[PDB]
Amino acid sequence: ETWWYNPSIVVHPHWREFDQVPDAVYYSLGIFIGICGIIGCGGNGIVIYLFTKTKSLQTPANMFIINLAFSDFTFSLVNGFPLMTISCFLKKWIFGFAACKVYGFIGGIFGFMSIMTMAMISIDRYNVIGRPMAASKKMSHRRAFIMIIFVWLWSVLWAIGPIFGWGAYTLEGVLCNCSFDYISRDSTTRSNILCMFILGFFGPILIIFFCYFNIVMSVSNHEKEMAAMAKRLNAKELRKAQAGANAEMRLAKISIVIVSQFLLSWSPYAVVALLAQFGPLEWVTPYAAQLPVMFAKASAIHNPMIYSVSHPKFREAISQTFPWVLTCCQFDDKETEDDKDAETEIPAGE
Numbered sequence: 239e240t241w242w243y244n245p246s247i248v249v250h251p252h253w254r255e256f257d258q259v260p261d262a263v264y265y266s267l268g269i270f271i272g273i274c275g276i277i278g279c280g281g282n283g284i285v286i287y288l289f290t291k292t293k294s295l296q297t298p299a300n301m302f303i304i305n306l307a308f309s310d311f312t313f314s315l316v317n318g319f320p321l322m323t324i325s326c327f328l329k330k331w332i333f334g335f336a337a338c339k340v341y342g343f344i345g346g347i348f349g350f351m352s353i354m355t356m357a358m359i360s361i362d363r364y365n366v367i368g369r370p371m372a373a374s375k376k377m378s379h380r381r382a383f384i385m386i387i388f389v390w391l392w393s394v395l396w397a398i399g400p401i402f403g404w405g406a407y408t409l410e411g412v413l414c415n416c417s418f419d420y421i422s423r424d425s426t427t428r429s430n431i432l433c434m435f436i437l438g439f440f441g442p443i444l445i446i447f448f449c450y451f452n453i454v455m456s457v458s459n460h461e462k463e464m465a466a467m468a469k470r471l472n473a474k475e476l477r478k479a480q481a482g483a484n485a486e487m488r489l490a491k492i493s494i495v496i497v498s499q500f501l502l503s504w505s506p507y508a509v510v511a512l513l514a515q516f517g518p519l520e521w522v523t524p525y526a527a528q529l530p531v532m533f534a535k536a537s538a539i540h541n542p543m544i545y546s547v548s549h550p551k552f553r554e555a556i557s558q559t560f561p562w563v564l565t566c567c568q569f570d571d572k573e574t575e576d577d578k579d580a581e582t583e584i585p586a587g588e
């Protein structure tokens with residue numbers, strides 16, 4: 239009788255008025271997300287493997303990186319193959335409502351986790367680079383551990399609403415993947431959406447900007463300070479300190495690129511969602527929602543590749559364990575120099 243009917247999940251009327259997209263579109267969608275599964279799990283596994291097992295990458299802050307990779311790993315796993323990919327190739331979600339909920343809930347829980355983890359990373363950056371060199375503070379296992387616990391609690395908190403009725407996780411677009419309900423406009427649903435956007439999204443964003451804008455409005459605070467201590471009879475041993483700042487600065491830069499990646503990846507879909515909940519629902523067509531959600535879903539497969547082209551210690555490790563990966567991005571000793579000096583201690587004024 240219809241092309242959208244699902245015996246397990248009640249498709250919102252809105253998605254029911256559209257014609258069924260062509261086979262080639264379903265197939266491309268499945269192939270697409272399936273490849274995010276491979277790259278995502280592949281790349282994130284490597285970071286988790288390399289970071290937990292390399293000695294040069296054993297600092298507390300790096301735990302955030304690992305946490306982020308676990309987050310992105312699980313997103314790519316659960317959101318790609320086989321729940322969506324298989325659904326596409328059959329032009330239908332055959333895994334039942336429970337799976338849909340788990341799917342949507344997992345997607346949200348780790349989407350909220352990736353930015354909040356980045357937030358914790360932006361904080362570490364502020365303590366090592368944002369504050370003055372005299373008050374510079376490095377991340378400690380204690381702190382770090384407590385921070386991720388906050389991250390996990392936070393992430394689950396703002397994504398579990400629909401699990402208990404305060405919102406919902408159902409099919410969207412071509413009906414082969416799940417997400418929260420941004421169509422229904424009842425008090426309940428709308429409050430959960432507002433909570434997701436404000437608490438889950440805008441929240442960590444503020445922390446981010448407050449930390450990076452704080453690192454920018456301190457580049458000069460540091461610019462002067464560097465000199466004051468420089469001519470402070472500080473010998474050639476001043477170079478050491480300088481290298482350290484460069485090394486840290488580079489990582490801070492990295493942090494920003496992965497954050498930019500996240501935002502550029504999710505903001506579109508976020509917007510289309512808001513239109514569906516506050517604007518012209520007639521705009522939210524099958525592709526209007528689908529295409530932007532795919533872009534969002536792939537977000538979880540970018541950090542590893544970003545790291546592989548700009549992270550020295552990490553690039554080192556790769557060259558030493560899975561060198562084929564760095565083919566087009568060949569590693570060199572000179573990439574780790576700044577880390578060498580930054581750590582090479584001075585023997586009693588040398």
Ligand SMILES: CCCCCCCCCCCCCCCCCCCCCC
Pocket residue numbers: 276277278279280281282284542543546563
């Ligand atoms: C049904 C036909 C299937 C053909 C499959 C051909 C696939 C061979 C793929 C080789 C892929 C290795 C991928 C795992 C590595 C993840 C890539 C991410 C790069 C991360 C860098 C940090």
Ligand SMILES: *C/C=C(C)/C=C\C=C(C)\C=C\C1=C(C)CCCC1(C)C
Pocket residue numbers: 317341342343345346347349350397415416417418434435438439504505507508511531534535
């Ligand atoms: C493909 C499956 C998905 C997108 C499942 C669930 C997604 C959410 C609960 C997303 C929430 C949001 C995030 C992570 C960041 C941008 C804004 C947002 C509220 C749409």
Ligand SMILES: CCCCCCCCO[C@@H]1O[C@H](CO)[C@@H](O)[C@H](O)[C@H]1O
Pocket residue numbers: 297299300303359362376485486489490492493577581
């Ligand atoms: C991109 C994510 C940035 C994570 C920053 C990890 C912070 C680890 O920064 C590390 O601090 C060590 C001193 O404790 C230095 O020896 C390392 O070179 C430096 O990379």
Ligand SMILES: *C(=O)CCCCCCCCCCCCCCC
Pocket residue numbers: 543546547563564566567
């Ligand atoms: C060096 O660090 C590069 C590592 C190689 C990572 C593999 C990247 C393959 C992903 C292909 C992306 C295709 C999308 C098309 C974009 C224009």
